[PDB]
Amino acid sequence: LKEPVIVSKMAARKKITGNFEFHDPNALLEKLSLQLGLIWYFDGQAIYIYD
Amino acid sequence: MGNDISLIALLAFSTLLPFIIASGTCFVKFSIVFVMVRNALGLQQIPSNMTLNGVALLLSMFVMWPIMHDAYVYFEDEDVTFNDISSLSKHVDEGLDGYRDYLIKYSDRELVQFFENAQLKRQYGEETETVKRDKDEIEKPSIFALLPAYALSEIKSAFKIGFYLYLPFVVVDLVVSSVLLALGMMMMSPVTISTPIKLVLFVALDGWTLLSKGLILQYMDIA
Amino acid sequence: MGNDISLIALLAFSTLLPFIIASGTCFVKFSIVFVMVRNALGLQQIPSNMTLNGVALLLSMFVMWPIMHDAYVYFEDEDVTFNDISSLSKHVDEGLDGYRDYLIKYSDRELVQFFENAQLKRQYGEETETVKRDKDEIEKPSIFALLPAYALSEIKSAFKIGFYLYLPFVVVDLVVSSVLLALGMMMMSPVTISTPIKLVLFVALDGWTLLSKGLILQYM
Amino acid sequence: MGNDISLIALLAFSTLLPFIIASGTCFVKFSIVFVMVRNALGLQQIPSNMTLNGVALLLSMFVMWPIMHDAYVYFEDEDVTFNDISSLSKHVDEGLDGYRDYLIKYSDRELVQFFENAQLKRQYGEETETVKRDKDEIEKPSIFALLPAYALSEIKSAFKIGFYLYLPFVVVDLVVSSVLLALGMMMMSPVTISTPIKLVLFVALDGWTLLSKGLILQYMDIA
Amino acid sequence: MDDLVFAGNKALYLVLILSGWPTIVATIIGLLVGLFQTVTQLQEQTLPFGIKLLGVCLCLFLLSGWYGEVLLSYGRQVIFLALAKG
Amino acid sequence: MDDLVFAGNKALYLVLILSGWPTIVATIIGLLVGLFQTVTQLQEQTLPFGIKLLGVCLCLFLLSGWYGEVLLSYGRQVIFLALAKG
Ligand SMILES: CCCCCCCCCCCC[N+](C)(C)[O-]
Ligand SMILES: CCCCCCCCCCCC[N+](C)(C)[O-]
Ligand SMILES: CCCCCCCCCCCC[N+](C)(C)[O-]
Ligand SMILES: CCCCCCCCCCCC[N+](C)(C)[O-]
Ligand SMILES: CCCCCCCCCCCC[N+](C)(C)[O-]
Ligand SMILES: CCCCCCCCCCCC[N+](C)(C)[O-]
Numbered sequence: 001l002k003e004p005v006i007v008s009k010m011a012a013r014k015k016i017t018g019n020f021e022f023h024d025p026n027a028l029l030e031k032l033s034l035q036l037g038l039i040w041y042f043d044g045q046a047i048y049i050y051d
Numbered sequence: 052m053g054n055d056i057s058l059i060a061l062l063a064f065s066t067l068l069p070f071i072i073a074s075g076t077c078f079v080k081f082s083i084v085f086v087m088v089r090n091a092l093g094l095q096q097i098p099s100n101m102t103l104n105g106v107a108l109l110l111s112m113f114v115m116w117p118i119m120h121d122a123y124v125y126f127e128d129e130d131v132t133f134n135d136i137s138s139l140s141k142h143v144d145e146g147l148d149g150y151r152d153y154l155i156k157y158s159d160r161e162l163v164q165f166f167e168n169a170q171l172k173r174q175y176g177e178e179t180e181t182v183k184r185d186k187d188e189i190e191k192p193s194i195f196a197l198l199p200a201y202a203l204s205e206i207k208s209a210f211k212i213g214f215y216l217y218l219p220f221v222v223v224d225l226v227v228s229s230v231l232l233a234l235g236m237m238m239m240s241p242v243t244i245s246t247p248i249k250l251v252l253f254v255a256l257d258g259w260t261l262l263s264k265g266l267i268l269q270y271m272d273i274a
Numbered sequence: 275m276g277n278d279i280s281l282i283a284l285l286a287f288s289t290l291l292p293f294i295i296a297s298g299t300c301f302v303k304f305s306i307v308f309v310m311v312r313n314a315l316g317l318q319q320i321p322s323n324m325t326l327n328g329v330a331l332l333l334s335m336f337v338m339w340p341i342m343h344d345a346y347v348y349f350e351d352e353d354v355t356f357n358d359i360s361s362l363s364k365h366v367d368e369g370l371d372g373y374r375d376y377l378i379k380y381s382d383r384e385l386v387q388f389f390e391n392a393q394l395k396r397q398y399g400e401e402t403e404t405v406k407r408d409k410d411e412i413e414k415p416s417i418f419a420l421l422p423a424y425a426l427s428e429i430k431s432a433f434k435i436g437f438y439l440y441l442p443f444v445v446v447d448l449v450v451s452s453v454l455l456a457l458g459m460m461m462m463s464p465v466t467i468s469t470p471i472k473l474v475l476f477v478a479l480d481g482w483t484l485l486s487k488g489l490i491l492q493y494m
Numbered sequence: 495m496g497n498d499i500s501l502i503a504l505l506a507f508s509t510l511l512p513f514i515i516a517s518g519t520c521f522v523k524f525s526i527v528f529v530m531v532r533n534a535l536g537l538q539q540i541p542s543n544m545t546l547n548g549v550a551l552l553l554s555m556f557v558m559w560p561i562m563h564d565a566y567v568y569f570e571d572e573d574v575t576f577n578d579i580s581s582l583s584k585h586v587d588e589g590l591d592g593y594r595d596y597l598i599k600y601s602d603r604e605l606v607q608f609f610e611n612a613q614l615k616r617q618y619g620e621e622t623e624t625v626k627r628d629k630d631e632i633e634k635p636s637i638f639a640l641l642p643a644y645a646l647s648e649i650k651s652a653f654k655i656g657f658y659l660y661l662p663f664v665v666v667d668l669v670v671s672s673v674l675l676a677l678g679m680m681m682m683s684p685v686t687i688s689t690p691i692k693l694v695l696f697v698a699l700d701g702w703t704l705l706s707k708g709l710i711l712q713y714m715d716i717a
Numbered sequence: 718m719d720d721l722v723f724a725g726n727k728a729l730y731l732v733l734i735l736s737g738w739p740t741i742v743a744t745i746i747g748l749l750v751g752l753f754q755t756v757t758q759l760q761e762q763t764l765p766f767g768i769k770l771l772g773v774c775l776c777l778f779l780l781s782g783w784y785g786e787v788l789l790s791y792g793r794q795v796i797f798l799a800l801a802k803g
Numbered sequence: 804m805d806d807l808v809f810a811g812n813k814a815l816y817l818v819l820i821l822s823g824w825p826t827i828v829a830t831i832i833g834l835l836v837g838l839f840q841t842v843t844q845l846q847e848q849t850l851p852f853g854i855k856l857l858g859v860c861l862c863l864f865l866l867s868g869w870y871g872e873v874l875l876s877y878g879r880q881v882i883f884l885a886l887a888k889g
Contacts, residue, residue, distance in 0.1 A: 074328040086320045097526050105517040109642045113612050170336040176494030199332050203482040210473045217470040228459050247660040259646045438799035441728050442792050452736035456743045479792045492803030733860050740853045747847040
């Protein structure tokens with residue numbers, strides 16, 4: 001992503017496992033947001049992720 | 052103070068302190084162990100309860116002080132001011148975790164969960180679970196759930212220690228009574244003779260030093 | 275602050291609160307049971323009453339919390355319109371039914387009905403044929419009838435639990451006395467030999483957890 | 495009168511006074527010794543505890559007075575007014591040295607040092623090691639360490655004394671039984687005869703005078 | 718009250734069988750050592766006590782595991798009855 | 804008044820009745836075993852205890868019921884005498 005990522009302590013209680021690729025971080029981020037129920041934003045400096 | 056409600060909360064906590072100390076701190080253990088020692092030695096009046104409790108309180112102070120200090124240094128920072136209810140609430144919550152850790156280290160989770168499910172009215176209060184699934188339950192558990200579990204978990208521990216401490220003296224009693232029967236002095240009560248033997252035995256072991264050290268070492272570690 | 279006579283009523287209630295807890299809540303029962311455990315183990319001063327009561331008070335909150343929450347949201351959060359004596363009286367009374375039902379669940383009918391008739395004081399000395407031990411109800415007894423019947427039921431339940439708790443420890447020490455009389459050692463008292471046995475028996479049973487769990491399970 | 499905070503400190507001290515006397519003073523030793531003597535003579539109600547503790551409190555007052563007087567005179571002195579926190583705090587500290595130096599003679603070095611090690615801020619690795627020179631370490635360990643070590647060492651030394659006090663009466667109790675068996679009166683309880691012998695022995699020995707004198711001699715120096 | 722009847726009767730039965738075994742052993746040893754003194758016509762107070770002590774200690778070393786099983790079983794059972802109604 | 808005297812008398816009377824049977828059997832067993840030990844010379848002393856424990860427990864089993872009926876009837880009686888005045 002080339003950006004620092006901030007994750008809420010409510011979201012950080014969810015878990016994941018598996019083998020992943022990061023060919024296109026933005027698209028992967030969107031798919032996982034809708035599969036896990038996250039919401040995210042970007043202010044130009046850091047990415048923020050919440051439940 | 053900068054906030055009247057902060058002031059109110061601080062004074063309330065200061066008013067409840069002695070019941071928290073008596074119900075959520077190692078004082079629960081140390082208080083009991085010394086009284087069991089006195090009973091096993093067979094002494095009625097001496098030392099005084101307030102002597103024993105005074106020592107117990109001093110020792111517990113060392114163990115608990117690091118947490119109090121951490122929380123004070125955390126809370127006295129005015130470095131951030133709060134946009135909203137949730138931001139404040141989370142800031143406060145994250146401060147208790149130094150205490151919450153200590154309770155969760157020593158209580159036993161099956162009670163904690165049982166109480167959690169009980170204060171919620173959920174599924175009529177108790178129901179079966181087909182599946183067993185653990186959900187980082189360490190961070191979920193409310194302090195109002197943790198406190199009783201800690202209390203019971205530590206009372207039991209005290210009884211265990213007292214059990215072990217009784218055995219050596221029981222040996223002395225039965226031995227004295229048997230050698231008096233060997234002499235045929237059947238009328239004479241052992242307690243006239245067995246007591247001093249117990250006294251010198253404890254003095255030679257230096258039981259107070261070993262006992263006090265070991266109690267602390269269960270919680271801290273020191274060179 | 276709304277109506278100030280409602281303010282006076284709130285401060286009054288807040289002042290009486292500890293006696294209501296002490297006489298109309300399962301604190302009554304938990305407090306007794308834990309002290310009897312200490313007596314059955316034969317310990318005179320440890321754990322402190324400060325500790326035992328602290329535990330009992332905590333546990334009872336779990337049981338009572340569902341009721342206070344409902345009463346709060348019913349009275350304070352909901353704005354409502356009411357305009358006369360009868361409408362207000364009915365509104366207020368209806369809020370208490372959540373607690374009333376708990377008392378009637380844990381109280382004994384013939385005694386509650388006796389106190390009701392005693393406070394009407396009507397035609398008094400009414401006979402046992404004025405009653406026929408009916409079973410299913412839509413009666414709504416007074417709370418001043420329900421409180422003491424509750425207290426007097428809880429106490430009896432506690433005594434009953436205390437009966438069973440003594441038995442194993444009674445066995446444990448008559449065995450010790452009999453073995454000491456099988457030997458010659460009749461000059462020596464059992465107590466200093468008997469106490470540690472009771473302490474191990476109790477920890478092996480983990481009695482504190484079984485007690486707390488089972489006490490809670492009755493009210494679920 | 496004076497600094498409002500100095501007033502608060504004086505009143506707090508005077509509120510905690512009886513727990514200090516009960517936990518960090520020779521009263522601890524004398525209280526135990528007298529009760530043990532009563533048990534050695536085998537009396538369950540004579541003298542009253544209210545008499546024994548009264549005597550013990552008076553005897554302790556002599557030993558403790560000179561320190562209280564010296565510390566009082568040290569603070570009732572207009573000599574200076576203070577520029578800074580470090581000057582004031584070191585002036586305060588230099589006033590307690592008389593008491594600190596009383597506690598140091600009787601607490602035990604190894605236990606004291608263990609408690610001082612216990613207070614230091616925790617570290618994630620085991621704490622960084624140190625050795626410190628005598629003017630802190632020998633001369634000036636902290637009072638929150640000295641105090642419980644004192645209490646424990648005093649209790650121990652008290653039990654030790656009680657042990658020696660029991661021995662002659664144990665001798666009596668045995669001899670008298672053996673003589674009754676030599677006369678064949680096997681069924682008579684020997685307590686009925688041993689008790690008065692014990693009393694005779696104690697009055698002819700004048701045990702109260704000896705105990706009261708020697709206990710004071712352990713702390714005072716009299717010529 | 719079949720529950721009170723059961724718990725009360727079992728308490729006494731347990732006292733009787735828990736205590737019986739040591740006293741039986743002690744009595745049989747007592748009789749045999751009392752006899753041997755008669756056929757030998759040789760007499761002292763201490764020999765029977767000395768042997769009885771060993772006999773009872775062996776009895777306890779052997780049976781004590783079962784004493785624990787029996788007491789735990791009864792301990793659980795009475796608690797469940799006390800809190801059975803709910 | 805006479806109710807007081809009557810109730811107090813009855814208390815002693817019930818003590819006597821209930822305690823009487825166990826103490827009788829413990830006496831008879833004491834005499835028989837003591838005689839037997841003179842008829843054949845054996846100097847044991849726990850044998851009486853071993854037998855009389857079984858003797859007393861057996862009759863506690865037998866009388867367990869009548870004991871509770873008597874005490875209930877007495878309790879009801881004295882509660883009536885205390886409260887039913889008019
Ligand atoms: C008078 C007999 C006492 C025997 C011990 C009674 C049970 C408590 C202690 C042993 C418990 C069994 N356990 C857990 C060690 O296996
Ligand atoms: C082990 C000695 C003490 C045991 C006490 C048992 C009390 C039982 C009380 C009920 C007796 C009358 N019964 C059997 C009709 O219920
Ligand atoms: C003379 C000692 C009398 C002890 C009475 C209790 C005996 C049963 C419980 C202790 C059993 C000890 N054991 C055999 C496990 O080591
Ligand atoms: C010297 C007499 C000591 C009697 C008490 C001994 C401790 C209780 C027995 C613990 C072990 C119980 N057991 C054998 C079931 O494990
Ligand atoms: C050493 C035993 C002393 C027992 C004294 C009490 C006797 C009554 C026991 C309750 C009635 C009989 N039973 C069998 C139910 O226990
Ligand atoms: C020590 C007196 C004799 C033991 C019996 C004491 C009364 C226990 C209660 C009796 C209850 C009778 N029952 C079961 C019919 O209700």
